[PDB]
Design an enzyme around this catalytic site. Structure first.
Site, PDB file in Angstrom:
ATOM      1  N   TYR A 213      70.107  62.220  28.564  1.00  0.00           N
ATOM      2  CA  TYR A 213      70.680  60.864  28.645  1.00  0.00           C
ATOM      3  C   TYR A 213      71.886  60.671  27.734  1.00  0.00           C
ATOM      4  O   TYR A 213      72.920  60.110  28.126  1.00  0.00           O
ATOM      5  CB  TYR A 213      69.557  59.877  28.292  1.00  0.00           C
ATOM      6  CG  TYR A 213      69.967  58.424  28.197  1.00  0.00           C
ATOM      7  CD1 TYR A 213      70.382  57.741  29.335  1.00  0.00           C
ATOM      8  CD2 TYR A 213      69.916  57.727  26.992  1.00  0.00           C
ATOM      9  CE1 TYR A 213      70.747  56.404  29.256  1.00  0.00           C
ATOM     10  CE2 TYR A 213      70.284  56.398  26.942  1.00  0.00           C
ATOM     11  CZ  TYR A 213      70.703  55.747  28.055  1.00  0.00           C
ATOM     12  OH  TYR A 213      71.073  54.417  28.013  1.00  0.00           O
TER      13      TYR A 213
ATOM     14  N   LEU B 113      67.928  46.921  21.277  1.00  0.00           N
ATOM     15  CA  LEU B 113      68.020  45.566  21.847  1.00  0.00           C
ATOM     16  C   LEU B 113      66.661  44.987  22.157  1.00  0.00           C
ATOM     17  O   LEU B 113      65.675  45.692  22.385  1.00  0.00           O
ATOM     18  CB  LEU B 113      68.791  45.622  23.186  1.00  0.00           C
ATOM     19  CG  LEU B 113      70.242  46.120  23.066  1.00  0.00           C
ATOM     20  CD1 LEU B 113      70.872  46.223  24.454  1.00  0.00           C
ATOM     21  CD2 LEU B 113      71.050  45.177  22.154  1.00  0.00           C
TER      22      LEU B 113
ATOM     23  N   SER C 179      74.840  53.333  24.666  1.00  0.00           N
ATOM     24  CA  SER C 179      73.618  53.420  23.906  1.00  0.00           C
ATOM     25  C   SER C 179      73.870  53.955  22.507  1.00  0.00           C
ATOM     26  O   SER C 179      74.772  54.801  22.337  1.00  0.00           O
ATOM     27  CB  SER C 179      72.681  54.368  24.706  1.00  0.00           C
ATOM     28  OG  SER C 179      71.510  54.581  23.965  1.00  0.00           O
TER      29      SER C 179
END
Ligand code: NAP
Ligand code: NAP
Lengths: 314, 314
Positions: free
Chosen positions: B134, B164, B105
């Site tokens: 995360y 994305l 990410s």
């Protein structure tokens, strides 16, 4: 009595915690050697928590080493520490263990942090490469604690020691940790009547050292504070507490003190053709002090007792 | 044929990789749904690797969500991603899988990074708090790859996508990701003949967007480059590769483009009484370009095809 699991109880830090709690008639210690319980095995760790009715966890189990080990086996240091901490924290929460203390490292801080290093220096810059994999695993342990605290209302606290020394250290001349290495080197030089002991560098860098029994005392103090008091002095996403003296000492002063402690009568020599590390590295322990704990063991007193421990355990 | 395990093959990224490799007569895909293989279960993951003779792994399985989910379930996001990546990487190495691609990410980067963000911005400053747990899990995945590469001579590569969009996204008006949210909001406003669609903020911030099929193409390109070429363009402890367009677009331009794509004839309205994020956020994709891959799907073409996908899958 509170049922207290000290993970890693035979380690340098874990054993110091065990020595102090073993005196506590209010505590029932639950202890497993590695052979009895492999902390990397998630199923085994969950089975332990599901059968042993734990109230508190001191998470002192870890894969820890020096400079050569950290550079040579980086995958061991990241993977094993990730798994041990993830397994224990997850199993503690699944079995309604509300209190946990994660015992980490000061390698969490950036290589070029502001000194003295307050807890807010975490994540402010690049890590030392030697320790990077280990450090990331340690930081992940803090963030596991904080995330369980925030999502579930757990009380999973964390302490980060400065450089430690004391009984049960590795007293081998090759240790990259300066206190045990120098105690051993000076001991052997005094045995051999060596004229000098040469230390690489100028002796000018300032470092901070804490005796392991002070570490254990601070750790138990932090674990047992009321939650509202711990909350007042932390933030949910900046929750860890530095444990140390907050006081600098030159490598020169350390080496000369060790030489006196051991009774060496040769010369301490610094070879300034070899490079020094940064000029100053130490923790800011304002938060710990504000929480009402102050270290009790001075450097010379702690070195002397530590050397007497070595003498009795050669 | 190379036996390729795409972990997370039903996900947005994993399915894009599967669509392209499913056309490859040189590849034999090995796929397991969550129901067949729970990636959090270390024993099950090791049993899979010990019986299935895998040559390559695309590690596209993850626990991923938006702003509300990341703030609401932080422990899920740190713990599950730590375990999935640790299990897969460890089992791949134990079973002599030499090639792996970790798909991460762009939340890895500091909140206040220099723009455009080169790979060297990793770890240079504080993370966004919404995504911190995360992000730490993602960063640990990169550092697991690099540590296995360094200690064992593995070829565990990594790619970090920018924002994305594309088929198999979540097209719900409540999604915190602006493309799917706006496609859905504008679709519904065109159905309702709503006079306007109001977007919070001024529309001035610049962001970067990449279609998922470009992501998949870049990922396969990076996985399959010769190791000496991948080495020439990375460093062992700074090994990941940004995947993106390297080109900015205002939220204004994005919203107006979406409105055109969907055929909305009402007004796009920005409410500047609501705050904007940082003025500019995008990846520096110099390394990817140097490695010989350039994106093929322009924003308007990719939005139009993505909207046609939504239309066919309502
Ligand atoms: N080589 C070094 O330079 C070195 C090494 C250790 C400590 N130290 C000194 O001691 C300080 C504090 O060390 P520490 O107490 O954090 O480390 P430690 O003394 O190594 O203690 C860690 C404890 O965790 C146990 N453990 C590790 N993995 C385990 C597993 N899979 N299952 C169950 N038990 C597990 C270890 O058992 P096993 O031993 O059976 O693995 C050990 O008893 C370090 O900062 C340094 O000052 C130095
Ligand atoms: N809520 C959101 O806003 C959201 C969510 C996902 C994707 N996205 C969009 O899609 C982009 C890329 O997403 P992504 O492809 O990384 O995520 P994804 O679409 O959620 O794909 C992750 C895949 O991993 C699987 N997985 C997770 N845990 C697993 C486990 N324990 N065992 C086996 N399979 C496991 C998931 O299966 P299960 O679904 O069965 O868990 C899923 O198929 C995100 O950046 C965002 O643009 C948005």
């Amino acid at each position: 009595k509170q049922r207290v699991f000290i993970a890693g109880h035979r380690g340098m830090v874990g054993s110091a915690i065990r020595r102090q709690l073993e005196q506590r008639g209010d505590v029932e210690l639950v202890l497993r050697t590695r052979d009895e319980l492999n902390l990397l095995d998630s199923r085994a760790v969950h089975d332990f928590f599901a059968s042993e009715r734990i109230d508190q966890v001191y998470l002192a189990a870890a894969k820890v080493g020096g400079i050569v080990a950290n550079n040579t086996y980086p995958a061991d240091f990241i993977y094993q520490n990730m798994m041990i901490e993830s397994n224990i924290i997850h199993a503690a929460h699944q079995n309604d263990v509300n209190k946990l203390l994660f015992l980490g490292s000061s390698c969490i801080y950036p290589k070029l942090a502001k000194q003295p290093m307050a807890e807010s220096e975490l994540l402010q810059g690049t890590l030392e490469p030697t320790n990077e994999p280990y450090a990331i695993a340690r930081i992940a342990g803090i963030k596991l604690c904080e995330s369980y605290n925030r999502q579930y209302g757990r009380d999973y606290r964390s302490v980060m020691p400065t450089n430690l020394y004391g009984p049960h250290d590795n007293f081998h001349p090759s240790n990259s940790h300066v206190i045990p290495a120098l105690l051993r080197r000076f001991h052997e030089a005094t045995a051999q009547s060596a004229p000098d002991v040469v230390v690489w560098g100028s002796g000018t860098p300032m470092r901070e050292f804490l005796h392991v029994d002070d570490m254990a005392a601070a750790s138990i103090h932090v674990m047992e504070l009321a939650h509202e008091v711990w909350l007042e002095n932390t933030q949910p996403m900046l929750s860890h507490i530095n444990v140390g003296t907050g006081v600098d000492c030159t490598i020169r002063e350390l080496a000369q003190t060790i030489a006196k402690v051991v009774g060496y009568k040769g010369r301490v020599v610094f070879d300034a053709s070899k490079p020094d590390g940064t000029p100053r590295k130490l923790l800011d322990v304002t938060r710990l002090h504000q929480l009402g704990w102050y270290h009790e063991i001075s450097l010379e007193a702690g070195l002397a007792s530590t050397y007497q421990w070595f003498l009795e355990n050669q």
